[PDB]
């Protein structure tokens, strides 16, 4: 099938999106033929333009992302609810997806720290705490540090 085939549309779409999201997460690089590469370059330029839309940037930060999937589908649905389409919209959507990735991290990382802290303090509590008590607690480390 050619470009109009759903297969190419989905394939090229996946490459363009992945390249675009990985490209945005700057502030493994994707395999692309020549024409795809040209499209990818134009997309990066636009993403860069939108990053300077400071108000948009302010609102993505403010977004309640208890449910990032809900966020994506509510936004995607709202963007196209008037029944119109254009390339500007598809690109604006792709842009938003890449921002959701950064945003999703903004929630996973406190969680992750908390998770790892959980293991560490669990371990500390059950295995190290006796010895720490023998030092008179963390005031002992103050002493250790001369």
């Amino acid at each position: 099938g050619g470009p109009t085939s759903s297969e190419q549309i989905m394939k090229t779409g996946a490459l363009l999106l992945q390249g675009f999201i990985q490209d945005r997460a700057g502030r493994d690089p994707v395999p692309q033929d020549a024409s795809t590469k040209k499209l990818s370059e134009s997309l990066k330029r636009i993403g860069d333009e939108l990053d300077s839309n400071m108000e948009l940037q302010r609102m993505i930060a403010a977004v309640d992302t208890d449910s990032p999937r809900e966020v994506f589908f509510r936004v995607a649905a709202d963007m196209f609810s008037d029944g119109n389409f254009n390339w500007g919209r598809v690109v604006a959507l792709f842009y938003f997806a890449s921002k959701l990735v950064l945003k999703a991290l903004s929630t996973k990382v406190p969680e992750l720290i908390r998770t790892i802290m959980g293991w560490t303090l669990d371990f500390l509590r059950e295995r190290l705490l006796g010895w720490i008590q023998d030092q008179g607690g963390w005031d002992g480390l103050l002493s250790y540090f001369g």
């Binding site: 939108l50 108000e55 609102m59 509510r74 936004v75 709202d78 008037d82 254009n86 500007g88 598809v90």
Partner: peptide, 16 residues
């Protein structure tokens, strides 16, 4: 909120 963003992405898409 979420709704603000959709409307902005739409405005932006259309302008392009």
């Amino acid at each position: 909120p979420e709704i603000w963003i959709a409307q902005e992405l739409r405005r932006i898409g259309d302008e392009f």
